[PDB]
Symmetry: C3
């Protein structure tokens, strides 16, 4: 083993450490080798009223240093008049604690949509 400590042992045999996770609907996974954190979350919104709608989403845990990337998509909660695919999204701002997602619609009927976000950071 060439050492008397766990850290020294792993370094000498080139081993990594276990990842950790919260395996929840709004959850996260952390690589404890590099510190990278991946998170995923969702929020149910309801109908899109038209125009431009901003919504703040809070990550399951805060990134300790930075959020590097977000991946926003649309979920359908129900189909009252038309499908949630008539709503589209883009990210407005990204922070260590959450993001702002903007949505708009291209069909003016009632939806029941939600927003999903996957995020990468550390």
């Amino acid at each position: 083993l060439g050492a008397n400590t766990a850290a020294g042992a792993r370094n000498n045999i080139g081993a990594g450490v276990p990842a950790t996770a919260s395996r929840a609907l709004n959850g996260w996974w952390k690589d404890n080798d590099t510190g990278l954190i991946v998170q995923w979350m969702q929020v149910n919104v309801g109908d899109h009223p038209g125009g431009i709608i901003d919504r703040t989403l809070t990550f399951p845990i805060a990134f300790p240093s930075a959020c590097l990337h977000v991946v926003p998509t649309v979920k359908e909660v129900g189909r009252p008049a038309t499908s949630a695919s008539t709503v589209t999204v883009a990210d407005v701002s990204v922070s260590n604690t959450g993001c702002v997602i903007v949505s708009s619609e291209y069909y003016g009927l009632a939806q029941n949509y939600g927003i999903r976000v996957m995020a990468i950071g550390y």
Copy 2:
């Protein structure tokens, strides 16, 4: 090492286990520390005929317990009259075995689109 078993050895030096994967177009990666599984897949559809279209997608492998998150996006297979970016998607339902993705179009010309999904679960 402080133990006579591989599991006990790793616990004593704080080491994790190797991830496994199928590095395929429709593939998966599994963290065998936490059990988290990430999958990715695609299906070629063709033209969007208008209206609302639901399609069932089957994951490369079933999640043993639950799918936590899906990330659906649109791929362009070809460009017969207009681009596949005129088709948009949302997820309708998510299970341990697959998902239903709904699509609609905002330009009524011929596309050749497909659906991509990335999924997280365990």
Copy 3:
């Protein structure tokens, strides 16, 4: 330990190796057990002029063998007249070095959009 080499030691106790990463805005993470690489990137574009727009994006690093999956989404850089959610995207082609993303708009006002891509490969 049952061996005199680091690789043999890890095999005998069933330990994996540390992942590596570039924790940058345009960055990557590599599982050195399976070789899977995840990358993320963004590019600011500006206004969508209408019609169909193709753009080539270059991955932070080349995948040594193949890109298996891409996840393109839209970011809002600013809001000059309307939101970037009125622009939508699809992937046209994917290679070991990058991808081509096609975009179109469903509202003919000025945007300031960018393109985000998450990619999986090895």
